[PDB]
């Protein structure tokens, strides 16, 4: 039974190492969510600092890949940082060679192709991570593209990743079934972040303090993460209505 150790086909036409890489994705027990506004793309993720000895500022699963592209990772941090370093290198190389900023969907495809190679070549293992890329693209506008260990990728209106992804996914599905539009009809990114947090609270059924969340925001020509105090201001506005 060595067909379960390396990435070759089992009699059922399955790749067990790819399937077990999907299971490593939930090892951190963290849930992430991504939504699109009119002018922005917001990504939020749970932040858990279990040890008091940890420096909480260094605990993060959100990465600034380029000025325009942000990436949140679901999976163990070593593989997350491996992917992050590669995506940063690829984004920079793209700009040098082709004279313009790498689009979010093109980077997603590139990382997805690299993942596909690990599913076909035996000596390389899959990375146990799901990568969610976000930006405000100059051609396509607000953009969410997600990659997984199978080498699969697709664009999203909104998305969710983690152990409780289904609860969050259905919550978002039901909202877009009402509004009948592919985004959050809101002017400011501040209110889009408030929407994202509110709907995660409703879906998971947990309240959040400023240190329980981690937020990334993509606007035209820049992606940036929010500080704890910026998130607190967001939590206050939610509670006051």
């Amino acid at each position: 039974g060595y067909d379960r150790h390396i990435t070759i086909f089992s009699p059922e036409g399955r790749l067990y190492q790819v399937e077990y890489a999907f299971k490593a994705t939930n090892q951190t027990n963290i849930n992430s969510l991504a939504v699109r506004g009119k002018d922005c793309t917001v990504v939020i993720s749970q932040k858990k600092v279990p040890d008091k000895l940890l420096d909480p500022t260094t605990v993060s699963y959100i990465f600034c890949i380029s000025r325009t592209i942000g990436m949140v990772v679901n999976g163990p941090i070593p593989d997350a940082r491996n992917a992050a370093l590669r995506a940063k290198a690829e984004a920079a190389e793209f700009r040098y060679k082709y004279g313009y900023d790498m689009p979010c969907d093109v980077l997603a495809k590139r990382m997805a192709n690299l993942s596909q190679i690990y599913t076909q070549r035996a000596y390389m293992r899959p990375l146990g991570v799901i990568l969610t890329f976000v930006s405000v693209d100059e051609e396509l506008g607000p953009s969410i593209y997600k990659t997984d260990p199978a080498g699969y990728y697709v664009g999203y209106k909104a998305t969710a990743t983690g152990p409780k992804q289904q609860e969050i996914t259905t919550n978002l599905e039901n909202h877009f079934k009402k509004s009948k539009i592919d985004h959050i009809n809101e002017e400011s990114w501040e209110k889009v972040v408030e929407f994202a947090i509110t709907h995660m609270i409703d879906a998971l059924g947990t309240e959040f303090s400023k240190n329980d969340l981690e937020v990334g925001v993509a606007t035209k020509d820049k992606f940036f993460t929010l500080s704890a105090e910026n998130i607190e201001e967001r939590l206050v506005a939610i509670a006051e209505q």
């Binding site: 379960r4 390396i6 260094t58 163990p76 146990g128």
Partner: protein, 243 residues
């Protein structure tokens, strides 16, 4: 089964058992700690005196990278040395190209990526060490701890080896009782105490204390070993606290 026989193989759990077995080698090693202070960091390590024939103060365990970073580790000592040699190459190439000495967070990722690379193939073995390291850069003091999986985080205090639980408990008290912070000279004293308290887990053989530190005020942001009177003062403080 058979998933634990080869490195870089995911078990049905999604776990890399070979990395988890490397952790067992770390847990078998001697105790080492790190303490972040007001303007720097302090490192300390337990050195087991296997025999009287060991020359005191000669078998140095703590290693310097560049001139501003200190490294200590628990587990397979040769694996730690290999990692520090790489760290020194990474630090040299950074300074060669960019002129400025390598920042601590930047240095942390260089080690992290290298250790993580040894979990990607069956043709290599994971590192049998957890490494505590850090120092002072342009943005201030930083302390890190790096595991066999390639996982690392920033720390206020860090501990690894056989007496890590005892150490961690002591570190947690300091964080609670000193929210405003701890001075460099205090951190050296506290580091000595914690190693002495953590020595209850290795109480069969007697040991030798080794301490180092980087501080903006006390060492001009350079890594130095704690020697002579300052070391003895810390030993006396430590011996007073256990009695």
């Amino acid at each position: 089964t058979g998933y634990d026989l080869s490195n870089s193989v995911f078990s049905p759990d999604g776990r890399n058992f070979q990395v988890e077995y490397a952790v067992k080698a770390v847990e078998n090693g001697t105790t080492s700690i790190g303490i972040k202070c007001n303007d720097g960091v302090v490192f300390a390590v337990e050195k087991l005196i296997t025999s009287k024939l060991l020359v005191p103060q000669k078998n140095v365990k703590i290693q310097v990278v560049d001139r501003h970073i200190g490294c200590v580790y628990s587990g397979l000592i040769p694996d730690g040395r290999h990692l520090v040699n790489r760290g020194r190459e990474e630090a040299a190439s950074f300074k060669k190209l960019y002129k400025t000495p390598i920042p601590i967070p930047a240095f942390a990722d260089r080690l992290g990526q290298y250790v993580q690379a040894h979990t990607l193939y069956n043709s290599v073995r994971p590192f049998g060490v957890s490494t505590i390291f850090g120092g002072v850069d342009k943005n201030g003091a930083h302390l890190y701890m790096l595991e066999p999986s390639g996982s690392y985080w920033g720390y206020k205090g860090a501990a690894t080896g056989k007496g890590r639980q005892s150490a961690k408990a002591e570190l947690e008290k300091l964080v609670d009782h000193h929210p405003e912070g701890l001075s460099a000279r205090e951190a050296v004293k506290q580091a000595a105490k914690i190693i002495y308290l953590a020595h209850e887990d290795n109480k069969e053989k007697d040991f030798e204390l080794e301490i180092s530190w980087c501080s903006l005020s006390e060492t001009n942001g350079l890594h130095k070993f704690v020697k002579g009177d300052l070391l003895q003062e810390a030993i006396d403080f430590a011996q007073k606290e256990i009695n």
